[PDB]
Amino acid sequence: MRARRLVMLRHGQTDYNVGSRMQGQLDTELSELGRTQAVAAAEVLGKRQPLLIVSSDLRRAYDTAVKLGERTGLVVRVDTRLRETHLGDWQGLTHAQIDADAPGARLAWREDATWAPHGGESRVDVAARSRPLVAELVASEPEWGGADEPDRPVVLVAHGGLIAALSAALLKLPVANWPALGGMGNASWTQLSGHWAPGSDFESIRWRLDVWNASAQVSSDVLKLAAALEHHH
Amino acid sequence: MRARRLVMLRHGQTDYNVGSRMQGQLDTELSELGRTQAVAAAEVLGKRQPLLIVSSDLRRAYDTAVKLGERTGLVVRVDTRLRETHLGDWQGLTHAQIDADAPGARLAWREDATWAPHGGESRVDVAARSRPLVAELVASEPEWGGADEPDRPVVLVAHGGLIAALSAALLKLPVANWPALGGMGNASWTQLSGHWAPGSDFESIRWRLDVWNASAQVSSDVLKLAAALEHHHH
Ligand SMILES: [Ca+2]
Ligand SMILES: [Ca+2]
Numbered sequence: 001m002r003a004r005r006l007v008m009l010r011h012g013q014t015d016y017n018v019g020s021r022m023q024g025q026l027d028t029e030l031s032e033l034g035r036t037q038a039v040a041a042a043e044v045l046g047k048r049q050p051l052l053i054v055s056s057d058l059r060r061a062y063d064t065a066v067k068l069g070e071r072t073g074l075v076v077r078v079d080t081r082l083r084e085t086h087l088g089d090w091q092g093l094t095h096a097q098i099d100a101d102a103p104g105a106r107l108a109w110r111e112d113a114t115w116a117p118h119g120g121e122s123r124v125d126v127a128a129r130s131r132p133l134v135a136e137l138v139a140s141e142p143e144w145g146g147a148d149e150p151d152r153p154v155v156l157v158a159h160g161g162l163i164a165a166l167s168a169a170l171l172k173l174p175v176a177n178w179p180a181l182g183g184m185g186n187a188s189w190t191q192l193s194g195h196w197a198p199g200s201d202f203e204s205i206r207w208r209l210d211v212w213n214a215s216a217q218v219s220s221d222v223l224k225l226a227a228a229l230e231h232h233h
Numbered sequence: 234m235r236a237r238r239l240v241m242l243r244h245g246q247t248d249y250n251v252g253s254r255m256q257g258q259l260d261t262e263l264s265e266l267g268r269t270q271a272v273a274a275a276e277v278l279g280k281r282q283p284l285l286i287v288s289s290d291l292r293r294a295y296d297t298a299v300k301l302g303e304r305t306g307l308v309v310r311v312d313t314r315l316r317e318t319h320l321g322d323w324q325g326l327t328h329a330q331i332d333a334d335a336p337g338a339r340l341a342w343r344e345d346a347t348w349a350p351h352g353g354e355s356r357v358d359v360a361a362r363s364r365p366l367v368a369e370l371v372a373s374e375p376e377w378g379g380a381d382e383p384d385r386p387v388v389l390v391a392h393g394g395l396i397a398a399l400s401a402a403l404l405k406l407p408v409a410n411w412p413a414l415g416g417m418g419n420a421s422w423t424q425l426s427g428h429w430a431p432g433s434d435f436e437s438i439r440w441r442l443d444v445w446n447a448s449a450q451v452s453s454d455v456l457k458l459a460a461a462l463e464h465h466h467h
């Protein structure tokens with residue numbers, strides 16, 4: 001009857017861009033460096049005995065999640081509600097390309113979680129479609145926060161936009177303050193705690209931010225190696 | 234647009250932490266593990282080449298800051314504005330003692346940054362006394378976020394209550410939402426970035442939460458020695 005720990009892990013680096021090319025729901029793959037980052041995060045998070053792992057179906061997230069599944073003996077459940085924000089006309093574009101089409105729009109966008117100037121989803125939309133998964137897991141996982149092993153976390157493996165929107169919504173931050181959360185890094189993780197409440201009211205659970213954007217330390221020699229494995233230059 | 238990086242490091246573990254005994258402004262000592270974890274965090278944070286270090290005068294924070302000063306070669310400035318929340322009549326009491334004397338009070342306090350049923354400070358009081366240190370540093374450290382090495386952080390070494398209150402205030406979250414920022418762990422750290430356009434005043438800096446409550450990974454071999462050293466020093 002304790003607090004429910006909820007961990008959210010962002011995928012590692014993809015083989016696509018290493019910069020500002022927005023991905024959205026494009027189904028890009030991890031680079032060798034991103035796979036190494038996923039191992040490093042799984043080494044830390046595995047020690048905490050997750051209760052279950054749920055991943056976005058996008059390969060960059062799923063393959064990250066499998067590294068944690070291998071280290072915990074858990075199967076990776078896949079839920080399309082954990083997909084990254086659909087970025088509409090902006091998927092596959094760099095900041096430079098967006099800024100040339102509409103100067104000022106990208107920066108107004110970061111500060112208005114209700115806006116989707118691209119034909120895709122706003123951050124509010126993303127929270128609205130992912131929050132029901134957390135409510136379902138509260139209803140369906142009686143061991144989560146239970147008396148036997150109350151600190152075993154549910155782990156969600158997903159994407160930076162999803163994690164920021166879902167965390168801000170669970171925390172009940174006013175939408176004006178959603179930009180307070182800086183972007184999640186490569187294979188970084190976040191932890192929220194949902195504190196006990198009478199009855200079965202999900203809305204009565206009060207969430208608090210325990211960890212935002214923590215990461216595993218990885219040696220420079222390993223980072224150099226994994227980056228090099230991907231290229232012949 | 235430039236950015237100033239601000240790192241806040243919590244003190245290492247004390248015996249009161251292990252015992253779930255509220256500390257507040259009591260001047261408790263680092264345990265053997267607290268010293269060890271402070272070294273490990275200094276190893277991580279030292280690589281960032283901090284610009285300067287300011288620490289609370291409470292020894293658990295100061296002794297943590299000294300490990301970072303030794304690793305970096307920097308002096309540790311001391312500022313009482315970085316002291317932990319004064320917890321009033323709760324200082325020295327365990328969670329169970331508080332819950333027996335005032336059931337629901339600890340929970341109310343966790344959910345309300347204006348609440349101080351213990352007679353000490355609220356988190357609003359703690360932010361109000363500590364935020365001026367950050368404005369003073371902005372006004373008096375032209376190198377911070379400056380030309381040569383813009384990413385070198387200012388490091389404040391303090392306490393979990395202070396760090397949550399000061400961070401929420403810098404982010405300008407409404408007070409109602411300050412309880413969204415929870416605890417900080419044993420020598421864990423938080424990082425905010427202050428973004429500003431050249432010419433702006435302190436209030437025009439927009440702060441963002443880059444990292445909340447990150448930690449250094451420590452090997453099971455070094456946890457087992459600090460446990461043996463804490464045990465053998467009964
Ligand atoms: Ca490793
Ligand atoms: Ca245009």
Ligand SMILES: [Ca+2]
Nearest residue numbers: 015229230231
């Ligand atoms: Ca390749």
